[PDB]
Amino acid sequence: MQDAITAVINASDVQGKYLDTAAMEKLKAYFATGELRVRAASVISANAANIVKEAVAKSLLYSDITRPGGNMYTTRRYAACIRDLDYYLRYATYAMLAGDPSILDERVLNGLKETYNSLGVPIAATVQAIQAMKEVTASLVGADAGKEMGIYFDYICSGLS
Amino acid sequence: LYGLVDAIIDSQEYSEAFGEDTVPYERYITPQGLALRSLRVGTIGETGVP
């Protein structure tokens, strides 16, 4: 649970040094991008359900995954899958606000692959859906903030894979 | 967290065991928790061979 500001100061703290000028430059960078990050976060908040719905339609619906015997087929499984996509999008938004994928590490990816492998969830199909969510999010929040959201979606994909 | 906490504390099992007057207490352990406690030298005693 480190944001960019906390990460900068934490590294300084471990070294035992007052904030250096280079660290000030890194903090300035976070403050500089803050406005676009906050704006995109509010946009995702408003369109949260739609982002997930579009991603499911773009990557998962009318496919082997949702047709009978595909592990998203039963209604309980469909509800579970969209719940997980909601979880991914919410923590990606938190990560964009903070500037750090550490929240994704601690709250999503610390045991996710083992749970998915045990349950039988197809990792590749989830990765496809998360990638589609990246495309939809980029359109909704704008390309400039879309690059920022993209890195955190990629973090989820790298950990999940 | 607040919703999950109230779900656990409102559950029928919290009222059935621990009631509404009792501090919660460890009621069960997984077998590899009993492995850690009860199979160290000094706690194994005779447990395992006649």
């Binding site: 692959k113 083992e114 492998n117 045990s118 990792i123 590749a124 990765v127 894979s161 | -």
Partner: protein, 49 residues
């Protein structure tokens, strides 16, 4: 009742070979920065295209 085998990690087999990937693949597996000649071969393709 069918217990699993290790854990399933997504595996990406190569559908087809191309000159970019092929040159880079062999360089990676021999642990050497793309040799000047092989780099020029990729450059032949890239100046073309």
């Amino acid at each position: 009742v069918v217990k699993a085998s290790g854990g399933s990690s997504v595996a990406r087999p190569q559908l087809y070979q191309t000159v970019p990937v092929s040159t880079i693949i062999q360089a990676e597996q021999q642990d050497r920065f793309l040799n000047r000649g092989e780099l020029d071969e990729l450059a032949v393709y890239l100046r073309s295209g």
